[PDB]
Design an enzyme around this catalytic site. Sequence first.
Site, short mmCIF file in Angstrom:
data_model
loop_
_atom_site.label_atom_id
_atom_site.label_comp_id
_atom_site.label_asym_id
_atom_site.label_seq_id
_atom_site.Cartn_x
_atom_site.Cartn_y
_atom_site.Cartn_z
N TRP A 49 -5.82 -5.89 -7.94
CA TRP A 49 -5.35 -4.54 -8.28
C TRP A 49 -4.82 -3.86 -7.03
O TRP A 49 -5.45 -3.98 -5.99
CB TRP A 49 -6.50 -3.76 -8.93
CG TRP A 49 -6.40 -2.27 -8.80
CD1 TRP A 49 -6.51 -1.54 -7.65
CD2 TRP A 49 -6.26 -1.32 -9.88
NE1 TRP A 49 -6.42 -0.20 -7.94
CE2 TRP A 49 -6.27 -0.04 -9.29
CE3 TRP A 49 -6.13 -1.43 -11.27
CZ2 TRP A 49 -6.11 1.12 -10.05
CZ3 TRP A 49 -5.98 -0.28 -12.03
CH2 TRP A 49 -6.01 0.98 -11.42
N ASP A 52 -2.50 3.42 -4.62
CA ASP A 52 -1.63 4.34 -3.83
C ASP A 52 -0.91 3.61 -2.70
O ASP A 52 -1.54 2.85 -1.96
CB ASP A 52 -2.43 5.45 -3.16
CG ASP A 52 -3.45 6.17 -4.03
OD1 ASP A 52 -3.53 5.88 -5.25
OD2 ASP A 52 -4.16 7.03 -3.45
N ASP A 179 -7.55 11.96 1.65
CA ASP A 179 -6.11 11.58 1.59
C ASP A 179 -5.33 12.34 2.67
O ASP A 179 -4.46 13.17 2.37
CB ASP A 179 -5.60 11.79 0.17
CG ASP A 179 -6.40 11.05 -0.90
OD1 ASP A 179 -7.17 10.11 -0.55
OD2 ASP A 179 -6.23 11.39 -2.09
N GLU A 233 -5.10 15.09 -5.09
CA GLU A 233 -5.08 13.76 -4.44
C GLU A 233 -3.74 13.58 -3.71
O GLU A 233 -2.75 14.27 -4.09
CB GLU A 233 -5.33 12.65 -5.45
CG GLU A 233 -6.74 12.67 -6.05
CD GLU A 233 -7.02 11.60 -7.10
OE1 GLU A 233 -6.20 11.45 -8.04
OE2 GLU A 233 -8.07 10.92 -6.95
O1 LIG Z 1 -8.35 4.26 -4.22
C1 LIG Z 1 -8.74 5.59 -3.96
C2 LIG Z 1 -7.50 6.44 -3.79
O2 LIG Z 1 -6.83 6.69 -5.04
C3 LIG Z 1 -6.73 8.10 -5.25
O3 LIG Z 1 -7.88 8.51 -6.02
C4 LIG Z 1 -5.43 8.49 -5.96
O4 LIG Z 1 -5.07 7.41 -6.83
C5 LIG Z 1 -6.87 8.72 -3.89
O5 LIG Z 1 -7.28 10.10 -3.96
C6 LIG Z 1 -7.91 7.79 -3.27
O6 LIG Z 1 -7.94 7.89 -1.86
#
Ligand SMILES: OC[C@H]1O[C@](O)(CO)[C@@H](O)[C@@H]1O
Length: 516
Positions: A49, A52, A179, A233
Amino acid sequence: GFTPDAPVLHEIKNHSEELTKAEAGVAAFAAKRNNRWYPKFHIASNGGWINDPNGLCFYKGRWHVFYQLHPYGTQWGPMHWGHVSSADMVNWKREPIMFAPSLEEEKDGVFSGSAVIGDDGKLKFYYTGHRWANGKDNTGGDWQVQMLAEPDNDELTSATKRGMVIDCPTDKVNHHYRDPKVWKTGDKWYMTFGVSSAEKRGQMWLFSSDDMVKWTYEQVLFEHPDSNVFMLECPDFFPIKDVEGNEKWVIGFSAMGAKPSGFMNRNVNNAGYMIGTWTPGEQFKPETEFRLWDCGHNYYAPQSFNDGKRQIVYGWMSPFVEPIPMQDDGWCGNLTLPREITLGADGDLHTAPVAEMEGLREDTVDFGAIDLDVSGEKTIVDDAEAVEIEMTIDLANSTAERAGLRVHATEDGAYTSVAYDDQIGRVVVDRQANAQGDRGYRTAPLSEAELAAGELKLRVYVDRGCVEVYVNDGRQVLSSYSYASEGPRAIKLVAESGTLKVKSLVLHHMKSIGLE
Ligand SMILES: OC[C@H]1O[C@](O)(CO)[C@@H](O)[C@@H]1O
């Protein structure tokens, strides 16, 4: 308080050992992968998988893309950073996995982050360290802090972790604290990341630094006005010149909790931007409503970066809705194409593909002007694995109520539709006739000006498992998974309930970016 004078390093695992474990996971999946939907010209993991895009940069002559990676399954799980690079953005290569959890403060995940070139010309990585707050699992919420790492070499094959540079005041927030993006404005370095406030409101916090290492809390840069939005996010923040040549700021984020309304905010969570103004010392001043980056089924967690001249954005094609049939195939998730961000006379962002994406074209098949003088369909090609279709619809001289392409048009009668719809005045990606996946449709708006213009340009990328639809040179984009059935995959030009005049239709076969 929660901003240490120096990076805090709590090494708990051998990083090289955890990286080697992760390489085995992705390689095992890659060897057993079903390639039916695996992209020929989008970035995915070789196995398992992804989510981001992370650490996006142009550094020492190469394009770098990192990504959230679960090496050990096709669903989300213990988070790593994968890595691909390119000299030309057309021909890519697999790099060593970059980050596996190896410090106390990241022991349950190496979460999203960014890369930026410092005053000394050297790259720094900023990323979130994830812990389960209950020390066990997700039932007790998240425990998140900001981490620094520095590359070992110009190729970015590996980085040395420096540890935590911003801690979490746990009792002043609702868990979510993640993030980071770091940038320079004037003589100050700034960092923003997303926070769920103690009142469960989505916020972006701002910190400043003289040296990029020691940080000072400044203020809340922005809070989402919708009380249903509890978290922002993957925040983004960058300057861009408007038509007048005035400097504007774009704020972006991946918003959690907004409720659907009509055509808007239909995905489980939704990424978008506002355009406005920013003076250091003040909050962001929006001058627009929230606008989606992408109007498609599968788009989230976009990150942008600057190559010295262009602001460029990738999204994660997010599958939030069951069933997700590619999860049976030893991989899940790909990125979009890279898009160049421009600000037009129309006072909105345009996100056409970067110019380098023309290097994907193996050929040009010109079908010329096509007239359907009655409702019907014409096959353009009997089989299309990986293509780019450019077409101009004459709106003024077409009576069809719905007109465009059927792609992934298989012998079982399944297809994905990409059409102009005159009843709603929108471009629509409709998956109703997909044989697998959650189906449904997505729309992109057309302005009064676009609807009065008498022609409509579509640029449609068809990969093995997805479509990307650029509308009027990227005024809007729709990215959706498209779960093509077995056998030949036709492209058809279709006019429903009237005539269609196509001024131009051109097909380009897409080359492999070398990651499959
Ligand atoms: O995999 C974790 C990452 O994915 C998110 O939730 C967004 O898709 C980010 O906020 C986080 O850092």
